[model samples]
Target: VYLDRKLLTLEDKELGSNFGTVKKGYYQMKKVVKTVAVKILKPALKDELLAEANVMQQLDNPYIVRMIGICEAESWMLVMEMAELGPLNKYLQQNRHVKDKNIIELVHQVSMGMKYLEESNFVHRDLAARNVLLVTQHYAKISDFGLSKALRADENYYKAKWPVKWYAPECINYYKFSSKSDVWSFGVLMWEAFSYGQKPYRGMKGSEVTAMLEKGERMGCPAGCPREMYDLMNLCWTYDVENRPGFAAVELRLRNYYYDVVNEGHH
Candidate 1:
């Protein structure tokens, strides 16, 4: 849908205290009296930005960020629902004493979103803690679809850039990305949540990390992470893409874990 530029007021300051890197700013809608996020894009990259918006428009899930509309007046803009608490990684870092139950819940929410994406035939090439946004302390939404792609009926993989730390071995080796690869990144995201946003392969070089994965070595479980959660991460990080569990399986496992935690009165 085309959004009237006159009805949207862009705030002078951007959202987030640390502003990682984006032209995203808070916007107020005159018609609905609601706040949203407007991601301003370069004119040269309008097509790419539009494509990202198009992909996001088709997605409708509680755990997935919603696309409000688009504007093409003075500058290209993609309007989206506001994530008040900002990115998950920064949120986790800021709230270091957060409970494990909350961490698992947030991760489970992401798994649900990813499961929906998988069923929709879309592969999120960039699934990580940084791409997750928090609407509330307990509600997380997947964002940043710049690297996402909808797989064609004839194709099984989407080729893209290598995000070493979060990528599966197949993605790093051949630039091929699929839902299984996304599961690999989900494992890394779990590590980030459990480790309170610590960077994956903390002091190791990208090449070193790649070599370690090639050697069938995986990072040890994060300190304080539950054994079951880490085991789920291991399932996602299975070396063979064929052996790695899909988002549906991952989501079910997390749901079961949540139930067990709740039943045991360990919230």
Candidate 2:
């Protein structure tokens, strides 16, 4: 195994986070000529560095980033797979000419990965297009588990305070997140994928919509992201957590939506 330095510019903080800056680094990991993206967490709080590694190690799926090894330095180095080309959202944004079938195929791939996480009883917690990367134009895998957590049935439930507008209403409360929370996020992510990575809501800056979300309000809709996709996004943001579907339901919905509804022409 070997390592190299790779400098990349990534927005280091989550939405609505404070005093955040995008961190760029060029850390290197051993190469796998055939695999996809590596993620090295910029250690901030004492907990962030180990959190991602512990969670990713438990994950096993083609749709997820693979952690082959790690190095403890000023920051934690995680040796993982990656694409030298670019991330998924950038690809979609750059290529608005992409067809619906290709987008559907990409969603299918991501759904498969999420299905793996669901089967293991875990939640990525920070599921988004930026977190999900592309190996090729029409293919992708989820990464960046710095906020991810494994669920335990024994723990008492608390309501979530921060709400990602892209997720359904239950996720905004930040309480008792279950497989249903994952489903809500997945639905919004599917809309993002279809819209070529457009922002979640229209006529609103990410910072301007904070309170409304904390109080249970959700995003409106962005332009060029597609109406059908927006419908799904709106459903994901619905105020009822109890109404959110399980991943099994989501997986079926995605599969059937493509095959039975949209007739996605994936080969």
Candidate 3:
């Protein structure tokens, strides 16, 4: 379907970028007018572009960023709901002194979103601070469904290339993918949260990560991170995919960590 371009008016504000340009914009006005972040994609990536839109359309949850509409033209354009603060990682990087309680809350929000996806049988192949969009300084919603596995197929495994650093051991080792693997990626995302947007593994190569992980090596928790949160991260990174915790369990554990510290009159 063709949507009128004039329906969207750019606000002269640039939203960050991944594979495309994202800009803050307003639609043709109404009582409940929607503010959107318009993403412009190249025609060369048409398949992936449509796939991203399809995934967003399938999701109708607050914790996940939804595509409000799509316009087909010389290139594909996606009008996504505006995240007030753009990507979570960028927000964290700029606010290095963010409180631990806030960090935990952000992680908790991601887990809740992932829990919904897990129950819905969707595997968010890329779960990280960068892929998380900030609804506000404290609220987050998962975005960038371009690499997600919708799982509406007959195959048991999804055989696609991935960012080696964010993957579970089995994903890098056997081309395997499942909700459990997404759980592993979630662990890395937690690491990102606690580390204040640090890149996973810092400088390790894919081969080194594969070798180290095969021998049961895991990244240590960020300094000042609570032991309970660290323990949850370890559970998500377990080499045996079956041993990993699901998003529901993760959500509960994170809540426990929050209550253990924050609710107990602590940071």
Candidate 4:
């Protein structure tokens, strides 16, 4: 839906909150009585903003953030559902005392959303902890589609920018991205969550990460993280993309692990 620009009222004097790396553009606005996030970008990026909105509009999953509407007034605005707890990384950092099982549960939720995207033939080029939003302690939603792309039936890869630390080996070497590459980033995001939002690879540069992965070295498991979760991370980081598990398979493993943990509590 395309909403009228005049219908949205600013809820705060200052910028409300940041989601993903796109910080300066976010605002808390109210449409009627319901609060929504309005992303107003520079006029130069009007096409990109509209493209992102169009991609988001086609997606309808509970674990993925919903796009409310778009407005093309003075500047293009993309309205979306508000994630009260903000980015998952920041939430994890602030609430470091949260249980490990809860962290896995949140990652499981992300896997489900990613599975939906994969099935829809969409590649979330920027799937990281910062791109995941927490609506509540138990509910998380995937957000930030500014770098997303839709793949044609015959297409298997999308060439994109380098985000080395979170990137799969093929992505680093050829700038090629696919669902498998997303799984690589998901592993890094899992590490971030388990480590209370620590930066992946600590102080390593992009080039250094490329070299390390070339040597078949992967990041160590976060302290106190379950071995099964770490094993899944290894599966995500498999050197050959073909060996990597798809999001649907990843979600199934996470679902079983989450249930096992929950059921164990009842024993």
Model 4 C-alpha lDDT versus the unseen true structure: 0.85
lDDT scores for all predictions?
0.86, 0.62, 0.83, 0.85
TM-score of 4: 0.92
Q: Which consecutive 10 residues in model 4 have the weakest lDDT in total?
A: 18-27
Candidates by TM-score, descending order: 1, 3, 4, 2
User: Which regions of candidate 3 deviate over 4 angstroms?
Assistant: 153-156
- Name the candidate, 2 or 4, with the larger lDDT value: 4
lDDT of 4 by residue, 34-112 (tens): 5677787553367788889989999999999998788777566788877888889888889989998899899999999
Q: Judging by lDDT against the true structure, name the best candidate.
A: 1
Worst 10 residues of 3 by lDDT: 153-162
Backbone clashes (count) for model 1: 0
Q: Assess every candidate by TM-score.
A: 0.93, 0.72, 0.92, 0.92
Per-residue lDDT of 256 in model 1? 98
lDDT of 4 at 231: 96
Which portions of model 1 show Cα errors greater than 4 Å? 16-31
RMSD of each: 2.5, 5.9, 2.1, 3.0
